[PDB]
């Protein structure tokens, strides 16, 4: 019942592999729907062609800024920002999807994929999905990051959509 979405990742335009996510629509339906719709592009905008602008090995991959490509942009399907829906789910380990934000109730389109347990984010960032297939591809992406987050190659979402 929970939706599955996929990202096809490229590295300087060269295919790397696919990552699929389960979105926890049962518990955070508003947050899950935003990511789902941005992945299909069905509202006329979304993640296809956008880059991961910040990757910190041993911490997370960050993406979703499809308007400014650097962490200063993005928007949700509900407007420029929407509310923290709940904090039911926790940052338990690698492979968690969690919203990036700039304070309370400032969710847009940016997100983190964790590559470590990040428990200090509990109750501040809204967890809304997990990596289902392709965690090995997230691990491969992580190798193009650096301590300050700058990527050594351009990591893009070459295609994305819904699998079920």
Numbering used by the authors: 2 to 165
Pull text from the paper.
For human peptidyl-prolyl cis/trans isomerase CypA, a combination of biophysical experimental techniques has elucidated general principles of the energy landscape during catalysis. To directly observe the changes in an enzyme’s energy landscape upon directed evolution, we turned to a previously designed second-shell mutation, S99T, in CypA that had three effects: inverting the equilibrium between two states that are essential for catalysis, decreasing their interconversion rate, and causing a parallel reduction in catalysis. Here, we use directed evolution to identify mutations that rescue the catalytic activity of S99T CypA. We measure the effect of the mutations kinetically, using NMR, and structurally, using room-temperature X-ray crystallography and multiconformer modeling.
Besides revertants to wild-type CypA (Ser99), our initial screen of ~1000 variants identified a variant (S99T/C115S) with increased activity. There is a weak epistatic relationship for C115S: it decreases activity in the wild-type background and increases activity in the S99T background. Our data show that the S99T/C115S and S99T/C115S/I97V mutations increase kcat/KM relative to S99T by 3-fold and 5-fold, respectively. In an effort to determine whether the observed changes in kcat/KM are due to changes in turnover number or substrate affinity, substrate binding was detected directly by NMR titration experiments. The dissociation constants are only slightly changed relative to the S99T mutant suggesting that the two mutations function by modulating the turnover rate rather than substrate binding. Interestingly, the exchange contribution, Rex, for group-I residues gets bigger with consecutive rescue mutations, indicating that these mutations increase the slow interconversion rate from the major to minor state (i.e., Rex = kmaj→min). Although we hypothesize, based on the NMR data, that the Phe113-in conformation is present at low occupancy in both S99T and S99T/C115S, it is not observable in the crystallography data. The interpretation of increased conformational heterogeneity of Phe113 and Thr99 was additionally confirmed by an alternative ensemble refinement method. The size reduction by the C115S mutation could contribute to the faster transition between the major and minor conformation due to the relief of a clash between the larger sulfur atom and Thr99.
